[PDB]
GROMACS .gro file of C-alpha atoms in nm:
model
  513
    1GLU     CA    1   1.472   3.294  -2.157
    2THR     CA    2   1.827   3.169  -2.090
    3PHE     CA    3   1.676   2.950  -1.813
    4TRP     CA    4   1.555   2.706  -2.077
    5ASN     CA    5   1.906   2.672  -2.230
    6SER     CA    6   1.979   2.414  -1.958
    7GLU     CA    7   1.830   2.064  -1.902
    8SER     CA    8   1.927   2.095  -1.533
    9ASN     CA    9   1.710   2.411  -1.510
   10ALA     CA   10   1.426   2.225  -1.679
   11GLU     CA   11   1.477   1.945  -1.426
   12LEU     CA   12   1.466   2.198  -1.144
   13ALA     CA   13   1.137   2.337  -1.279
   14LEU     CA   14   1.001   1.984  -1.312
   15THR     CA   15   1.079   1.911  -0.945
   16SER     CA   16   0.855   2.208  -0.859
   17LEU     CA   17   0.577   2.068  -1.080
   18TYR     CA   18   0.588   1.744  -0.879
   19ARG     CA   19   0.604   1.925  -0.544
   20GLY     CA   20   0.320   2.162  -0.616
   21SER     CA   21   0.207   2.329  -0.293
   22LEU     CA   22   0.320   2.048  -0.061
   23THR     CA   23   0.535   2.176   0.228
   24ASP     CA   24   0.720   2.012   0.514
   25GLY     CA   25   0.513   1.869   0.797
   26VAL     CA   26   0.174   1.923   0.948
   27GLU     CA   27  -0.107   2.060   0.733
   28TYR     CA   28  -0.454   2.157   0.854
   29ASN     CA   29  -0.609   2.134   0.508
   30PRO     CA   30  -0.515   1.983   0.173
   31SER     CA   31  -0.205   2.108  -0.003
   32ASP     CA   32  -0.256   1.869  -0.297
   33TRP     CA   33  -0.483   1.590  -0.412
   34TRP     CA   34  -0.201   1.359  -0.296
   35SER     CA   35  -0.107   1.524   0.035
   36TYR     CA   36  -0.206   1.343   0.353
   37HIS     CA   37  -0.501   1.574   0.419
   38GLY     CA   38  -0.586   1.596   0.049
   39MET     CA   39  -0.585   1.223  -0.015
   40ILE     CA   40  -0.592   0.995   0.294
   41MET     CA   41  -0.818   1.221   0.491
   42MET     CA   42  -1.077   1.227   0.215
   43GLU     CA   43  -1.177   0.901   0.383
   44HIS     CA   44  -1.341   1.130   0.641
   45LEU     CA   45  -1.592   1.225   0.371
   46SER     CA   46  -1.689   0.862   0.316
   47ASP     CA   47  -1.872   0.581   0.491
   48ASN     CA   48  -1.533   0.447   0.607
   49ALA     CA   49  -1.430   0.716   0.854
   50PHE     CA   50  -1.494   1.036   1.045
   51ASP     CA   51  -1.304   1.357   1.111
   52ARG     CA   52  -1.221   1.408   1.482
   53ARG     CA   53  -1.293   1.781   1.434
   54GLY     CA   54  -1.658   1.679   1.401
   55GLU     CA   55  -1.979   1.755   1.222
   56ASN     CA   56  -1.932   2.133   1.224
   57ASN     CA   57  -1.588   2.112   1.068
   58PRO     CA   58  -1.607   2.247   0.708
   59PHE     CA   59  -1.402   1.958   0.567
   60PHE     CA   60  -1.660   1.709   0.694
   61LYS     CA   61  -1.930   1.937   0.555
   62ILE     CA   62  -1.812   1.864   0.197
   63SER     CA   63  -2.025   1.547   0.195
   64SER     CA   64  -2.259   1.579   0.497
   65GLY     CA   65  -2.525   1.793   0.327
   66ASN     CA   66  -2.380   2.126   0.445
   67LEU     CA   67  -2.142   2.226   0.166
   68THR     CA   68  -2.158   2.588   0.059
   69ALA     CA   69  -1.947   2.778  -0.193
   70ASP     CA   70  -1.746   2.969   0.068
   71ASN     CA   71  -1.596   2.643   0.204
   72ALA     CA   72  -1.222   2.683   0.275
   73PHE     CA   73  -1.134   2.324   0.185
   74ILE     CA   74  -1.287   2.326  -0.162
   75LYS     CA   75  -1.106   2.658  -0.222
   76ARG     CA   76  -0.772   2.492  -0.132
   77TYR     CA   77  -0.829   2.203  -0.369
   78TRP     CA   78  -0.925   2.452  -0.642
   79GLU     CA   79  -0.634   2.689  -0.598
   80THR     CA   80  -0.364   2.424  -0.557
   81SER     CA   81  -0.496   2.259  -0.876
   82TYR     CA   82  -0.488   2.577  -1.083
   83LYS     CA   83  -0.153   2.681  -0.935
   84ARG     CA   84   0.002   2.355  -1.053
   85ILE     CA   85  -0.182   2.378  -1.388
   86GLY     CA   86  -0.041   2.726  -1.445
   87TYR     CA   87   0.314   2.616  -1.368
   88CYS     CA   88   0.270   2.314  -1.599
   89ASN     CA   89   0.148   2.545  -1.873
   90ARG     CA   90   0.450   2.770  -1.835
   91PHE     CA   91   0.681   2.468  -1.833
   92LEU     CA   92   0.525   2.323  -2.150
   93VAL     CA   93   0.554   2.656  -2.329
   94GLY     CA   94   0.902   2.737  -2.198
   95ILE     CA   95   1.060   2.402  -2.290
   96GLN     CA   96   0.930   2.387  -2.647
   97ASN     CA   97   1.229   2.549  -2.811
   98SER     CA   98   1.500   2.374  -2.605
   99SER     CA   99   1.738   2.121  -2.761
  100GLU     CA  100   1.575   1.794  -2.851
  101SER     CA  101   1.663   1.493  -2.639
  102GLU     CA  102   1.513   1.189  -2.476
  103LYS     CA  103   1.513   1.379  -2.146
  104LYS     CA  104   1.320   1.671  -2.301
  105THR     CA  105   1.059   1.432  -2.444
  106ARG     CA  106   1.026   1.257  -2.109
  107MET     CA  107   0.990   1.580  -1.913
  108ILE     CA  108   0.718   1.708  -2.147
  109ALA     CA  109   0.530   1.382  -2.082
  110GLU     CA  110   0.578   1.426  -1.705
  111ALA     CA  111   0.442   1.779  -1.716
  112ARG     CA  112   0.144   1.665  -1.922
  113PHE     CA  113   0.076   1.379  -1.681
  114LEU     CA  114   0.089   1.612  -1.382
  115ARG     CA  115  -0.133   1.874  -1.548
  116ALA     CA  116  -0.385   1.612  -1.653
  117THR     CA  117  -0.409   1.468  -1.303
  118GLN     CA  118  -0.526   1.809  -1.181
  119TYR     CA  119  -0.803   1.825  -1.439
  120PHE     CA  120  -0.893   1.462  -1.351
  121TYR     CA  121  -0.958   1.555  -0.991
  122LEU     CA  122  -1.126   1.888  -1.077
  123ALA     CA  123  -1.353   1.703  -1.321
  124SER     CA  124  -1.432   1.441  -1.057
  125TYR     CA  125  -1.570   1.691  -0.806
  126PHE     CA  126  -1.633   2.039  -0.951
  127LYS     CA  127  -1.708   1.876  -1.293
  128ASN     CA  128  -1.754   2.181  -1.519
  129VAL     CA  129  -1.450   2.407  -1.487
  130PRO     CA  130  -1.219   2.616  -1.704
  131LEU     CA  131  -0.986   2.409  -1.921
  132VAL     CA  132  -0.677   2.628  -1.933
  133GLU     CA  133  -0.377   2.517  -2.140
  134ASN     CA  134  -0.213   2.849  -2.225
  135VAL     CA  135  -0.025   3.095  -2.009
  136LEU     CA  136  -0.271   3.367  -1.910
  137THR     CA  137  -0.230   3.707  -1.750
  138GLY     CA  138  -0.418   3.771  -1.427
  139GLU     CA  139  -0.695   3.950  -1.619
  140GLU     CA  140  -0.732   3.673  -1.877
  141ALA     CA  141  -0.758   3.418  -1.597
  142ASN     CA  142  -1.050   3.618  -1.448
  143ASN     CA  143  -1.260   3.582  -1.767
  144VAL     CA  144  -1.226   3.217  -1.868
  145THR     CA  145  -1.539   3.007  -1.935
  146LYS     CA  146  -1.631   2.658  -1.811
  147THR     CA  147  -1.570   2.344  -2.017
  148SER     CA  148  -1.805   2.053  -1.953
  149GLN     CA  149  -1.703   1.749  -1.754
  150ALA     CA  150  -1.742   1.533  -2.064
  151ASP     CA  151  -1.507   1.754  -2.266
  152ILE     CA  152  -1.250   1.770  -1.983
  153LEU     CA  153  -1.252   1.391  -1.948
  154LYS     CA  154  -1.205   1.347  -2.326
  155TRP     CA  155  -0.907   1.585  -2.307
  156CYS     CA  156  -0.768   1.389  -2.011
  157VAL     CA  157  -0.788   1.068  -2.217
  158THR     CA  158  -0.581   1.231  -2.491
  159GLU     CA  159  -0.330   1.374  -2.244
  160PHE     CA  160  -0.280   1.059  -2.033
  161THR     CA  161  -0.248   0.852  -2.350
  162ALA     CA  162   0.018   1.086  -2.492
  163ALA     CA  163   0.200   1.105  -2.161
  164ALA     CA  164   0.205   0.727  -2.120
  165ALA     CA  165   0.360   0.684  -2.465
  166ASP     CA  166   0.665   0.894  -2.366
  167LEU     CA  167   0.714   0.795  -2.004
  168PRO     CA  168   0.949   0.512  -1.912
  169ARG     CA  169   0.798   0.182  -1.812
  170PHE     CA  170   0.799   0.097  -1.441
  171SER     CA  171   1.077  -0.161  -1.482
  172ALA     CA  172   1.306   0.114  -1.621
  173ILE     CA  173   1.266   0.350  -1.323
  174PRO     CA  174   1.582   0.320  -1.107
  175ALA     CA  175   1.586   0.372  -0.730
  176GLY     CA  176   1.716   0.725  -0.780
  177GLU     CA  177   1.404   0.820  -0.973
  178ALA     CA  178   1.160   0.696  -0.705
  179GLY     CA  179   0.849   0.911  -0.715
  180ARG     CA  180   0.877   0.999  -1.087
  181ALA     CA  181   0.579   0.914  -1.311
  182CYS     CA  182   0.602   0.598  -1.519
  183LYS     CA  183   0.405   0.475  -1.819
  184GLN     CA  184   0.184   0.262  -1.595
  185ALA     CA  185   0.101   0.563  -1.370
  186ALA     CA  186  -0.035   0.748  -1.672
  187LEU     CA  187  -0.223   0.436  -1.789
  188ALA     CA  188  -0.381   0.394  -1.442
  189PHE     CA  189  -0.509   0.750  -1.449
  190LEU     CA  190  -0.629   0.688  -1.804
  191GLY     CA  191  -0.824   0.391  -1.672
  192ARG     CA  192  -0.974   0.592  -1.388
  193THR     CA  193  -1.070   0.866  -1.639
  194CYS     CA  194  -1.247   0.611  -1.854
  195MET     CA  195  -1.442   0.474  -1.555
  196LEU     CA  196  -1.563   0.831  -1.484
  197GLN     CA  197  -1.681   0.852  -1.845
  198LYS     CA  198  -1.841   0.512  -1.801
  199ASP     CA  199  -1.631   0.408  -2.108
  200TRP     CA  200  -1.580   0.071  -1.950
  201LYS     CA  201  -1.434  -0.090  -2.261
  202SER     CA  202  -1.156   0.169  -2.282
  203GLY     CA  203  -1.097   0.149  -1.907
  204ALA     CA  204  -1.056  -0.228  -1.919
  205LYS     CA  205  -0.800  -0.182  -2.197
  206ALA     CA  206  -0.599   0.079  -2.002
  207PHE     CA  207  -0.576  -0.139  -1.692
  208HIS     CA  208  -0.513  -0.453  -1.903
  209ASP     CA  209  -0.224  -0.269  -2.076
  210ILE     CA  210  -0.060  -0.230  -1.735
  211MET     CA  211  -0.107  -0.601  -1.666
  212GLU     CA  212   0.031  -0.704  -2.008
  213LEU     CA  213   0.343  -0.488  -1.971
  214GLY     CA  214   0.429  -0.731  -1.692
  215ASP     CA  215   0.635  -0.501  -1.470
  216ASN     CA  216   0.398  -0.512  -1.174
  217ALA     CA  217   0.284  -0.771  -0.925
  218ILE     CA  218   0.102  -0.812  -0.597
  219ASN     CA  219   0.341  -0.779  -0.302
  220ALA     CA  220   0.340  -1.063  -0.045
  221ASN     CA  221   0.314  -0.820   0.245
  222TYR     CA  222   0.016  -0.582   0.265
  223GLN     CA  223   0.136  -0.364   0.555
  224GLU     CA  224   0.472  -0.298   0.393
  225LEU     CA  225   0.309  -0.129   0.095
  226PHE     CA  226   0.250   0.169   0.322
  227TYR     CA  227   0.582   0.196   0.505
  228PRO     CA  228   0.879   0.416   0.419
  229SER     CA  229   1.137   0.135   0.454
  230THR     CA  230   0.961  -0.097   0.209
  231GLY     CA  231   0.708   0.100   0.009
  232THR     CA  232   0.936   0.175  -0.285
  233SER     CA  233   1.104  -0.168  -0.303
  234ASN     CA  234   0.811  -0.366  -0.435
  235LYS     CA  235   0.648  -0.411  -0.777
  236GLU     CA  236   0.299  -0.309  -0.661
  237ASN     CA  237   0.326   0.064  -0.582
  238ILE     CA  238   0.312   0.219  -0.930
  239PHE     CA  239   0.276   0.586  -0.829
  240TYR     CA  240   0.332   0.719  -0.477
  241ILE     CA  241   0.442   1.012  -0.263
  242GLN     CA  242   0.767   0.957  -0.075
  243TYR     CA  243   0.842   1.178   0.228
  244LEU     CA  244   1.203   1.209   0.347
  245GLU     CA  245   1.256   1.352   0.694
  246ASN     CA  246   1.552   1.567   0.581
  247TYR     CA  247   1.341   1.729   0.301
  248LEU     CA  248   0.962   1.744   0.313
  249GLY     CA  249   0.873   1.518   0.600
  250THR     CA  250   0.516   1.412   0.660
  251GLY     CA  251   0.313   1.540   0.953
  252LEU     CA  252   0.069   1.248   0.924
  253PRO     CA  253   0.204   1.086   1.246
  254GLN     CA  254   0.149   1.401   1.452
  255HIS     CA  255  -0.200   1.421   1.315
  256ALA     CA  256  -0.312   1.059   1.311
  257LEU     CA  257  -0.128   0.873   1.586
  258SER     CA  258  -0.311   0.850   1.919
  259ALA     CA  259  -0.207   1.035   2.235
  260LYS     CA  260  -0.001   0.747   2.377
  261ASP     CA  261   0.223   0.778   2.071
  262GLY     CA  262   0.229   1.159   2.058
  263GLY     CA  263  -0.052   1.221   1.811
  264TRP     CA  264  -0.379   1.412   1.782
  265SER     CA  265  -0.611   1.126   1.665
  266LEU     CA  266  -0.756   1.321   1.370
  267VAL     CA  267  -0.824   1.011   1.149
  268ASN     CA  268  -1.107   0.793   1.294
  269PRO     CA  269  -1.235   0.479   1.113
  270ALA     CA  270  -1.606   0.413   1.146
  271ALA     CA  271  -1.814   0.109   1.241
  272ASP     CA  272  -1.942   0.061   0.885
  273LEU     CA  273  -1.584  -0.007   0.766
  274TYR     CA  274  -1.512  -0.230   1.067
  275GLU     CA  275  -1.824  -0.434   0.984
  276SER     CA  276  -1.737  -0.474   0.616
  277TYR     CA  277  -1.446  -0.718   0.649
  278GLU     CA  278  -1.537  -1.084   0.600
  279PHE     CA  279  -1.475  -1.359   0.849
  280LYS     CA  280  -1.162  -1.562   0.766
  281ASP     CA  281  -1.370  -1.824   0.578
  282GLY     CA  282  -1.492  -1.549   0.343
  283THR     CA  283  -1.845  -1.531   0.475
  284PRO     CA  284  -1.996  -1.188   0.564
  285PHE     CA  285  -1.954  -1.042   0.905
  286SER     CA  286  -2.240  -1.038   1.154
  287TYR     CA  287  -2.241  -0.931   1.519
  288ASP     CA  288  -2.490  -1.215   1.570
  289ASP     CA  289  -2.241  -1.479   1.459
  290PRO     CA  290  -2.067  -1.664   1.740
  291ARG     CA  291  -1.725  -1.584   1.585
  292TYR     CA  292  -1.777  -1.215   1.680
  293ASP     CA  293  -1.559  -1.150   1.985
  294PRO     CA  294  -1.605  -0.810   2.150
  295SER     CA  295  -1.277  -0.872   2.341
  296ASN     CA  296  -1.078  -0.901   2.016
  297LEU     CA  297  -1.240  -0.716   1.732
  298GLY     CA  298  -1.007  -0.842   1.460
  299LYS     CA  299  -1.011  -1.208   1.558
  300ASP     CA  300  -1.132  -1.453   1.291
  301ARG     CA  301  -1.160  -1.164   1.044
  302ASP     CA  302  -0.990  -1.078   0.716
  303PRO     CA  303  -0.626  -1.001   0.809
  304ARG     CA  304  -0.664  -0.661   0.639
  305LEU     CA  305  -0.884  -0.545   0.928
  306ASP     CA  306  -0.604  -0.560   1.184
  307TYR     CA  307  -0.356  -0.441   0.918
  308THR     CA  308  -0.564  -0.128   0.855
  309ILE     CA  309  -0.730  -0.024   1.181
  310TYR     CA  310  -0.691  -0.068   1.557
  311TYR     CA  311  -0.925  -0.042   1.855
  312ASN     CA  312  -0.939  -0.074   2.233
  313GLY     CA  313  -0.712  -0.352   2.353
  314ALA     CA  314  -0.508  -0.380   2.035
  315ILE     CA  315  -0.130  -0.345   2.040
  316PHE     CA  316   0.013  -0.057   1.835
  317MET     CA  317   0.376   0.051   1.844
  318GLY     CA  318   0.435  -0.206   2.117
  319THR     CA  319   0.181  -0.077   2.368
  320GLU     CA  320  -0.189  -0.128   2.419
  321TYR     CA  321  -0.437   0.123   2.278
  322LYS     CA  322  -0.678   0.221   2.561
  323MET     CA  323  -0.998   0.387   2.445
  324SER     CA  324  -1.340   0.354   2.609
  325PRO     CA  325  -1.628   0.557   2.747
  326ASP     CA  326  -1.518   0.422   3.087
  327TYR     CA  327  -1.157   0.546   3.087
  328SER     CA  328  -0.990   0.871   3.194
  329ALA     CA  329  -1.018   1.185   2.984
  330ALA     CA  330  -0.709   1.326   3.161
  331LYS     CA  331  -0.513   1.031   3.017
  332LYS     CA  332  -0.675   1.086   2.670
  333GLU     CA  333  -0.811   0.731   2.703
  334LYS     CA  334  -1.179   0.826   2.716
  335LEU     CA  335  -1.418   0.801   2.423
  336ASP     CA  336  -1.621   1.121   2.433
  337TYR     CA  337  -1.724   1.425   2.224
  338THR     CA  338  -1.449   1.665   2.340
  339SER     CA  339  -1.107   1.509   2.409
  340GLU     CA  340  -0.802   1.506   2.186
  341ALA     CA  341  -0.866   1.142   2.113
  342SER     CA  342  -1.065   0.923   1.875
  343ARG     CA  343  -1.430   1.010   1.826
  344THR     CA  344  -1.514   0.655   1.712
  345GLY     CA  345  -1.305   0.414   1.920
  346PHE     CA  346  -1.103   0.315   1.610
  347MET     CA  347  -0.773   0.443   1.481
  348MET     CA  348  -0.579   0.397   1.157
  349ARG     CA  349  -0.290   0.147   1.164
  350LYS     CA  350  -0.212   0.180   0.790
  351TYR     CA  351   0.093   0.395   0.698
  352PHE     CA  352   0.268   0.356   1.038
  353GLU     CA  353   0.585   0.146   1.040
  354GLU     CA  354   0.552   0.048   1.406
  355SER     CA  355   0.888  -0.114   1.474
  356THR     CA  356   1.091   0.181   1.341
  357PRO     CA  357   1.133   0.490   1.560
  358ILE     CA  358   1.010   0.826   1.435
  359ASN     CA  359   1.248   1.104   1.524
  360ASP     CA  360   0.993   1.383   1.470
  361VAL     CA  361   0.623   1.305   1.434
  362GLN     CA  362   0.579   1.647   1.269
  363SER     CA  363   0.835   1.572   0.994
  364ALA     CA  364   0.871   1.199   0.940
  365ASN     CA  365   0.969   0.962   0.672
  366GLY     CA  366   0.660   0.826   0.496
  367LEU     CA  367   0.531   0.655   0.185
  368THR     CA  368   0.172   0.696   0.064
  369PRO     CA  369   0.075   0.508  -0.252
  370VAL     CA  370  -0.147   0.681  -0.507
  371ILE     CA  371  -0.178   0.392  -0.757
  372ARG     CA  372  -0.132   0.030  -0.648
  373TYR     CA  373  -0.138  -0.272  -0.878
  374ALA     CA  374  -0.421  -0.416  -0.665
  375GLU     CA  375  -0.639  -0.124  -0.778
  376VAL     CA  376  -0.537  -0.192  -1.139
  377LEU     CA  377  -0.644  -0.557  -1.112
  378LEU     CA  378  -0.976  -0.472  -0.945
  379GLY     CA  379  -1.031  -0.187  -1.189
  380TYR     CA  380  -0.981  -0.418  -1.487
  381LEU     CA  381  -1.237  -0.662  -1.343
  382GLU     CA  382  -1.487  -0.383  -1.262
  383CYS     CA  383  -1.455  -0.254  -1.620
  384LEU     CA  384  -1.507  -0.601  -1.774
  385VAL     CA  385  -1.818  -0.654  -1.561
  386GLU     CA  386  -1.962  -0.313  -1.654
  387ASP     CA  387  -1.875  -0.365  -2.023
  388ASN     CA  388  -2.073  -0.692  -2.039
  389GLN     CA  389  -1.761  -0.903  -2.109
  390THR     CA  390  -1.776  -1.277  -1.998
  391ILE     CA  391  -1.594  -1.345  -1.676
  392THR     CA  392  -1.405  -1.672  -1.644
  393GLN     CA  393  -1.241  -1.833  -1.345
  394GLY     CA  394  -0.908  -1.752  -1.516
  395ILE     CA  395  -0.994  -1.381  -1.517
  396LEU     CA  396  -1.102  -1.399  -1.152
  397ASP     CA  397  -0.776  -1.576  -1.065
  398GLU     CA  398  -0.561  -1.308  -1.232
  399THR     CA  399  -0.754  -1.020  -1.070
  400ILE     CA  400  -0.964  -1.042  -0.754
  401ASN     CA  401  -0.811  -1.372  -0.641
  402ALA     CA  402  -0.456  -1.240  -0.693
  403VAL     CA  403  -0.550  -0.957  -0.454
  404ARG     CA  404  -0.719  -1.192  -0.207
  405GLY     CA  405  -0.444  -1.452  -0.249
  406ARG     CA  406  -0.168  -1.218  -0.138
  407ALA     CA  407   0.036  -1.431   0.108
  408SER     CA  408  -0.023  -1.202   0.407
  409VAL     CA  409  -0.400  -1.201   0.341
  410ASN     CA  410  -0.475  -1.541   0.185
  411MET     CA  411  -0.852  -1.504   0.172
  412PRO     CA  412  -1.069  -1.763  -0.004
  413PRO     CA  413  -1.100  -1.723  -0.380
  414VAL     CA  414  -1.408  -1.586  -0.555
  415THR     CA  415  -1.580  -1.810  -0.812
  416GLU     CA  416  -1.883  -1.589  -0.891
  417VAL     CA  417  -1.915  -1.510  -1.261
  418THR     CA  418  -2.279  -1.378  -1.276
  419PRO     CA  419  -2.235  -1.006  -1.359
  420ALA     CA  420  -2.498  -0.850  -1.131
  421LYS     CA  421  -2.364  -1.047  -0.838
  422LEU     CA  422  -2.002  -0.993  -0.932
  423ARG     CA  423  -2.047  -0.611  -0.943
  424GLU     CA  424  -2.119  -0.606  -0.571
  425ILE     CA  425  -1.839  -0.850  -0.491
  426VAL     CA  426  -1.584  -0.636  -0.680
  427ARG     CA  427  -1.705  -0.309  -0.524
  428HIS     CA  428  -1.683  -0.468  -0.184
  429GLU     CA  429  -1.336  -0.612  -0.245
  430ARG     CA  430  -1.221  -0.275  -0.363
  431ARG     CA  431  -1.359  -0.117  -0.041
  432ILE     CA  432  -1.166  -0.361   0.173
  433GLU     CA  433  -0.844  -0.361  -0.026
  434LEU     CA  434  -0.816   0.017  -0.049
  435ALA     CA  435  -0.963   0.115   0.286
  436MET     CA  436  -0.821   0.434   0.443
  437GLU     CA  437  -0.623   0.526   0.128
  438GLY     CA  438  -0.841   0.820   0.015
  439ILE     CA  439  -1.021   0.649  -0.275
  440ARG     CA  440  -1.354   0.558  -0.112
  441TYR     CA  441  -1.515   0.899  -0.158
  442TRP     CA  442  -1.408   0.907  -0.524
  443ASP     CA  443  -1.567   0.563  -0.568
  444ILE     CA  444  -1.900   0.626  -0.391
  445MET     CA  445  -1.932   0.950  -0.591
  446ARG     CA  446  -1.863   0.795  -0.935
  447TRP     CA  447  -2.086   0.495  -0.855
  448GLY     CA  448  -2.377   0.718  -0.758
  449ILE     CA  449  -2.414   0.549  -0.418
  450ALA     CA  450  -2.280   0.833  -0.201
  451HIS     CA  451  -2.633   0.956  -0.137
  452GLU     CA  452  -2.718   0.611   0.001
  453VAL     CA  453  -2.415   0.549   0.220
  454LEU     CA  454  -2.387   0.914   0.335
  455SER     CA  455  -2.756   0.941   0.430
  456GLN     CA  456  -2.695   0.769   0.762
  457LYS     CA  457  -2.578   0.798   1.115
  458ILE     CA  458  -2.212   0.720   1.187
  459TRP     CA  459  -2.130   0.463   1.457
  460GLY     CA  460  -1.810   0.366   1.636
  461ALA     CA  461  -1.663   0.062   1.807
  462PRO     CA  462  -1.877  -0.169   2.013
  463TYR     CA  463  -1.870  -0.137   2.394
  464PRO     CA  464  -2.097  -0.403   2.546
  465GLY     CA  465  -1.872  -0.413   2.855
  466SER     CA  466  -1.886  -0.038   2.920
  467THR     CA  467  -2.051   0.084   3.237
  468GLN     CA  468  -2.075   0.444   3.116
  469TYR     CA  469  -2.198   0.373   2.762
  470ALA     CA  470  -2.571   0.379   2.828
  471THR     CA  471  -2.573   0.727   2.982
  472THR     CA  472  -2.304   0.896   2.771
  473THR     CA  473  -2.357   0.786   2.409
  474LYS     CA  474  -2.576   1.052   2.243
  475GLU     CA  475  -2.790   0.766   2.106
  476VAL     CA  476  -2.799   0.400   2.215
  477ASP     CA  477  -2.717   0.180   1.914
  478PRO     CA  478  -3.059   0.070   1.788
  479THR     CA  479  -2.912  -0.250   1.642
  480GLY     CA  480  -2.828  -0.371   1.995
  481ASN     CA  481  -2.453  -0.395   1.942
  482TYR     CA  482  -2.350  -0.119   2.182
  483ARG     CA  483  -2.171   0.084   1.914
  484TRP     CA  484  -2.073   0.439   2.010
  485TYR     CA  485  -2.284   0.716   1.849
  486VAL     CA  486  -2.045   0.929   1.643
  487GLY     CA  487  -2.251   1.166   1.428
  488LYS     CA  488  -2.458   1.181   1.110
  489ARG     CA  489  -2.477   1.291   0.748
  490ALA     CA  490  -2.761   1.393   0.517
  491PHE     CA  491  -2.590   1.406   0.176
  492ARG     CA  492  -2.818   1.572  -0.077
  493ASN     CA  493  -2.916   1.394  -0.399
  494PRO     CA  494  -2.818   1.537  -0.651
  495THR     CA  495  -2.651   1.849  -0.511
  496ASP     CA  496  -2.366   1.686  -0.319
  497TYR     CA  497  -2.246   1.490  -0.622
  498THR     CA  498  -2.098   1.822  -0.743
  499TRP     CA  499  -1.890   2.072  -0.545
  500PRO     CA  500  -1.981   2.438  -0.620
  501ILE     CA  501  -1.728   2.668  -0.778
  502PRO     CA  502  -1.556   2.850  -0.491
  503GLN     CA  503  -1.735   3.173  -0.402
  504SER     CA  504  -1.431   3.395  -0.455
  505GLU     CA  505  -1.403   3.274  -0.815
  506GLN     CA  506  -1.774   3.318  -0.883
  507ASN     CA  507  -1.739   3.674  -0.753
  508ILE     CA  508  -1.449   3.762  -0.981
  509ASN     CA  509  -1.554   3.583  -1.295
  510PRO     CA  510  -1.915   3.615  -1.408
  511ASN     CA  511  -1.869   3.312  -1.634
  512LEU     CA  512  -1.831   3.092  -1.321
  513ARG     CA  513  -2.166   3.198  -1.166
   0.00000   0.00000   0.00000
């Protein structure tokens, strides 16, 4: 009532809309689509990575062929979404009659952006869900009906478009507003919404609008995009989550560092990601190529491999990572099926600013991008290809080659303009560029290839020099490359393209059965 008489009170409410259910530190399940477990660890559901908790862990079961409606992780995603939606709805109603101002107009756009992102993610995975815009009582909420995915996505287009119009451009966001949604953040989600609709023409336009605004650019340094000290002082990270150790610190280090650095090794990259990176001359990787060096897995490979993952013998935080079937379990250096250590032989390097001390691995500074300009450039190109628009070398140079040409990466430029061939090149570049950032599952789902890439066994790092490998891997690598057997998936086509409505909600509301 009187609360809304004050712009500072509106600002306070808006801070809660951004925060959602995120809390300080370690989380054992998602607290938001953008939390470390909600976003980054979705890579565990993809062909890029594995969850150390293993094949029986219900998070991993989301895409392994074993998802059921009583799953605790899908219920978290559902409830945190609808909790934020409900607070956005109250905010949008409550602010309507407050004094007009530029700040009021901006904050309405921020609330609409935030609400629409929740429906974007709900629509990506649950697909057909209640579209709630009004403040409901508990009873009313228990009797809502589903809206189709197509109708939700159309609504998201309208909402992201309206939000973008009234959000400041990226260049107008000062340092003190780091983390706040800009025009380009809303346009990037608009573009992703259009790709889900397969409205490729509209998606190309949304991403191209970001490019033509001219506020963003590819950063010279790839690693620094993901570090707290540098991640907000570049022109590439459009939308991100900043963690400040005195406020809501991130527990990602506790969870994803290895034992030598105080962590629990929860995040484990897989062999199929390791194998995806090109050689330095841009040709595809093969274990049969003489450039493959089992003593230095990142040597003569795309620099993004060593920037993103590490492995036995690599240096991380100034000391050597030791991980092998031959090493000591007491030292948490053994690769096995039980220790508090990597299940694959790989670890994630991305997001860890190695030269800067971390005072508390359970509540650290951190910076996790949600929308990067590299995704915008690759998204634009993907949309043009899918919309049957002619690709020129100029277009390649402004998109895929700007991403590959980043100074710290400097990979050979693409010249392919044949659309069928370019589709696979762009999808692959996107896989490499965005690896371990929580987008791969979203991509393999929307592309309709999840049932192909998640129909397979999961392998780990190669160990040709291991004496214990032959008798301790659950299965000897049938390709002859001595990769560790990690586990398997049997994603169901079509069932696992859609998450079921959580069981508790089906039980309450007959319209959701």
